[PDB]
């Protein structure tokens, strides 16, 4: 269905034959990043939900595949399985809680 | 020595045609997919090639088909050593069967 990722197509009539006009989703401008696997916080090892770990060089923020928009690493986009001695090239950083704060009032 | 099957085609007005593209380029072109797809993952089939480590794009791979990423980075070494058995098999197998 086209080269690229798909959308729609459009048929169009032709003397003996078809023709479709697909309709792509193509990445035009990339830039480069470092990233790690999972986050060792308190003594947790943290996996993303949905997306990626990457690092403009000072901070860590969570991001989906396809599109760059940075997020804060968040209790609510990532999971909890096991603690950081296994995972090879964790790295550390902080996870912010949205309880604590509305707690604490 | 005798005469050949194929020096008797080729004087009773039958010819090969050899092929357009050479062994070299297919394999260069095999080449060049295997070094697509083990460094940028699907992403050079979409438009421009964007890298990513193997164990990341492992971990994708995992999750597309059911199985949450936290299992293979706790078991790496177990999925890889796994990935050079069965790659070693096929050695064994295309050494000796001819079939
Ligand atoms: C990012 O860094 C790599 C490594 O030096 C470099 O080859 C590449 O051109 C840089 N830029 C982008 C957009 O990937
Ligand atoms: C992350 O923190 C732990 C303990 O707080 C420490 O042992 C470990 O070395 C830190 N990671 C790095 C890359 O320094």
Known sequence: CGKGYHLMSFPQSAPHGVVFLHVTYVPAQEKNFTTAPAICHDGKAHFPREGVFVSNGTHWFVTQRNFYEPQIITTDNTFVSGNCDVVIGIVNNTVYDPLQPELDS | ?99
Do not use: H
């Open chain 2, 1 to 99: 020595a005798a005469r050949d099957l194929i020096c008797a085609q080729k004087f009773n007005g039958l010819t090969v045609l050899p092929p357009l593209l050479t062994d070299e380029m297919i394999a260069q072109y095999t080449s060049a997919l295997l070094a697509g797809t083990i460094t940028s993952g699907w992403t050079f089939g979409a438009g421009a090639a964007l890298q990513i480590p193997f164990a990341m794009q492992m971990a994708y791979r995992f999750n597309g088909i059911g199985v949450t990423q936290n299992v293979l980075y706790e078991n790496q070494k177990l999925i890889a050593n796994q990935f050079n058995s069965a790659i070693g098999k096929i050695q064994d197998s295309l050494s000796s069967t001819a079939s």
